[PDB]
Amino acid sequence: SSNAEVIKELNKCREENSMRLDLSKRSIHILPSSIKELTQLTELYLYSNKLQSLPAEVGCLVNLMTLALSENSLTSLPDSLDNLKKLRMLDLRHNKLREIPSVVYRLDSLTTLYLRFNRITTVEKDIKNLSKLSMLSIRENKIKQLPAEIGELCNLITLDVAHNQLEHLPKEIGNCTQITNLDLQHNELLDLPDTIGNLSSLSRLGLRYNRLSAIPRSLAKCSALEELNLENNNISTLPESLLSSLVKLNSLTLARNCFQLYPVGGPSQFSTIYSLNMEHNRINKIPFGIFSRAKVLSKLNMKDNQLTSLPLDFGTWTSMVELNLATNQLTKIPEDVSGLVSLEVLILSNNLLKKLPHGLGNLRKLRELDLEENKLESLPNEIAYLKDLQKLVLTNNQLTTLPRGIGHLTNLTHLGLGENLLTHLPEEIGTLENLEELYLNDNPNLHSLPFELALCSKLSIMSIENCPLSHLPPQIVAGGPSFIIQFLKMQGPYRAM
C-alpha cells in the first residue's frame, strides 16, 4: 500500500473532520507526522499494520479516547502519549513488546488495556496509577509475578492473565472486590491466596493447567461462581463445605487431578450441578448416596479411573443423561441400571464386562452405547428394547452371535462389530432400515453374510477386512463391500423386487 493513499485519506479525514479515523490493514510501515492536525479525533484505529513506532505527534490527539494498535511490531511508545487525558481504551496486542511501555502507566484515564501476545515479563508497581482500569488483559506473556499494587485497581472487573508464568498470586488481589472474571489458566500457580475469597462478585474463575495442590476454603465465599474448572492440577481433596456453598455452581470439572476418593461434603455438595467431570483420576469408589440430592445432575464423566464396582444406589440416578465409565475396572453392570430411565449416552469402553444385565432393556432413551474393549461373551435379549438406540459399538470383544432382537434397533445407524468372533450375522440384520455403518473387520470366523443384509438400503460404510467370507466367491470378496452387497441382492431372494 502506497503512503500517498494514506496521505489522501488523512486529508479526507481532515476535511470531513471525522471524530473517527480508521487506517487499519494498510501495511503501513511508517506514519506521517501530519497526524498532528487531526486534534478532533476521539478514535484512532491502526491495527494490523507493520508499525515499529509511533510518532510523538500522536500525543497531540488530546481528545483521543480509543487507540487501537494491535497486530504490529511495536517495541515502545512515545512519551508524548501522556497528553491523552481522555484515553479510555489502549489496545497493544500481538505487538512484540517486552515491557509495558512506561507512558502507559501515566494514562490515569484508562479503563480498558489489552497487552496480549507480547513478551512482557513483569508488571511494575506503577500499575496502581491506572485506578480507573476495569479491563486488564495481559494474557500470553512471560509474567512471573504480579506486583502487590495490582490490589489498588479497585474498579477492575476482568483480569485475564492466562498463559503466563505466575507461581503465586499476590494476596492483595482480594481488594479488587469488583472482579467477576479472573482467568488464570495455563500458569504455574502453586497455591491461591486466602484473600481470593474476598472477590465476592466472582462468577468466572479460570484455574486449569496450573500446579495447585489444594483449594483455599475461603473460595466458598464466592457464591457467584457458576463454573469451577480445576482441570490439570494436583488437587487431591477439596475443602469441606466448598462445593455446597457455591449455590450457583452448575459445572464442576475435577479432571486430571489426583483424586483417590470423592470430595468430602456429603450429598448436598452436588445439589446445583448439571455436569460433573471427574476424568483421569484414581477414584476407586463412588460413594453410596452421593447423588441423592443432585436433582439436576445430567452428565457424569468418570473416564480413566479405578472403579471396580458401581454403588448400590446406582438406580437412584434417575436424572442422569450422559454417563461415562470408560477406562475403568468394572466387571459387571448391576440390574439397577434400569432406573436410569433418562439415560441417553452410556460409555463403558475399556472395562472387564463379560455380560450385560437384563435391565439394559429399560434404557428407553438410550441413543449411544459404547462397549468397546470389554470381554463380552454375549448380548442379553432385552437389547431389542432400545428403540431409540442409534449407535451400538461392540468393537474388540468376544461376541460370537447376535440375538435375533438386534433387528429391532430400528433407529440404529452405527453397528460396530470389529475384532470379535462372529460366526454369522442373524438374518434380522435386514430390518435395520436406517443402518448406515456396519463394521465387521477382524472377524476371523465370519465366513458368510446373510442375504438380508441387502435390505439395509442406507448402508454406506462396511468393513470386511480379515474376514474369511469363504462361503462367498473369491472374486466377490476381493471386490470389496460394493461387490458383496451387489452379490447378496442378485443371488438372494430379493433380486426381482
Numbering used by the authors: 85 to 581
What does the paper behind this entry write?
RAS proteins are GTP-dependent intracellular molecular switches that are anchored to the plasma membrane, which activate the RAF kinases through direct binding and membrane recruitment, resulting in RAF dimerization and pathway activation. Prior to pathway activation, RAF is trapped in a catalytically inactive conformation by 14-3-3 through its interaction with a specific NTpS (pS365 in BRAF) that is required for 14-3-3-dependent negative regulation, and a phosphoserine (pS) C-terminal to RAF kinase domain5 (CTpS). Genetic knockout of Shoc2 suppresses the growth of a subset of KRAS-mutant cancer cell lines and inhibits tumour growth in mouse models of KRAS-driven lung cancer, demonstrating that SHOC2 function is critical for RAS–RAF pathway activation. Here we present a cryo-electron microscopy structure of the SHOC2–PP1C–MRAS complex to an overall resolution of 3 Å, revealing a tripartite molecular architecture in which a crescent-shaped SHOC2 acts as a cradle and brings together PP1C and MRAS.
